[PDB]
Amino acid sequence: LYFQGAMVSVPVVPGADIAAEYLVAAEDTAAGGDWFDALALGDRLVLVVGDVVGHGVEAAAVMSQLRTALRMQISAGYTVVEALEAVDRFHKQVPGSKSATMCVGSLDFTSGEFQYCTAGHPPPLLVTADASARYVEPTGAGPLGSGTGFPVRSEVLNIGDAILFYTDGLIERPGRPLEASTAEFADLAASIASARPIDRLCSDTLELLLRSTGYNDDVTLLAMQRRAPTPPLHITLDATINAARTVRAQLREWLAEIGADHSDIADIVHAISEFVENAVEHGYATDVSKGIVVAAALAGDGNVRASVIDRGQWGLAMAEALVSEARIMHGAGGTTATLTHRLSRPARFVTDTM
Ligand SMILES: [Mn+2]
Ligand SMILES: [Mn+2]
Secondary structure, eight states: OBSSSSBOEEEOBTTEEEEEEEEOSSSSOSOOSEEEEEEEOSSEEEEEEEEOSSOSHHHHHHHHHHHHHHHHHHHTTOOHHHHHHHHHHHGGGSTTOTTOEEEEEEEETTTOEEEEEEESSOOOEEEOTTSOEEEOOOOSOOOTTSSOOOOOEEEEOOTTOEEEEEOTTTTSOTTOOHHHHHHHHHHHHHHHTOOOHHHHHHHHHHHHHHHTTOOSSOEEEEEEEEOOOOOOEEEEEOSSTTHHHHHHHHHHHHHHHHTOOHHHHHHHHHHHHHHHHHHHHHBOOSOOTTOEEEEEEEOTTSEEEEEEEESOBOOHHHHHTTSSEEEEEEETTEEEEEEEEEOEEEOEEOOOOO
């Protein structure tokens, strides 16, 4: 979810929790030379952090183009390497884009394989399940317009393992030398690791690191922890007056496990509750036993898809106005009401200590 091509929010997926927090060096401006991105592409999750030189009203403009450029290639299904190379060739047409740096990674949901490239960009922190932090190795890539190419490495992340993409603003803090400030970020991430766990890992790291020391560049932190997927939801109920109350309760449990934001929860629970109520009241089978089937699942593209199937009734404008997409189908002996809703959690935009 974007506002003006800018990511104001992070997606939600079965096999990873993602959080994002950022600060902008300037005053009264929504963006600088930094950006982050997280694209849920089905069989994988692609993470992006980037830094454009000299922020800078001019630096935002450059960032905006690069972001749109990288997103277009990634979402068209090119690999990390191919995408980065498309962008590097594109930079010629984007003045000020030379020496922009990026860190891009792709998580395979099945294997935990996380293929990443550090294009002249400080390397990701890995916080493991047993609260060991350590930096992943730099891939050997350099920034845009460096002719270094874009070589890529891999790390296997287990369930509970997290990884932290960040910009140099996080570790180049006022009155702090690089190797000390690097080692403090790592230790603190370790410390905090012994909401969702990735939220506080992301939130608390950044706010203690900057608590006293302040900041002087753009700062962007994009964290994701691998998790075991919540199984899909399935309920088979009697077409009774309490059916909706039953479904709502369980749908709430489920969406909490999934890790959805309250707005998405409110939307989706509203839609499905109304489908169930409509099924009950409208409502023409005199056999009410197991007359209602509800199913809901989160896919790796960040959409929840749900269906309410009943034994036929004598919801569109309602549901179409609440969730990304809704549909109703009728046949003899049945009605199916469906919804598809994209999940998002907002990024945290902070302004504290200069
Ligand atoms: Mn910059
Ligand atoms: Mn910077």
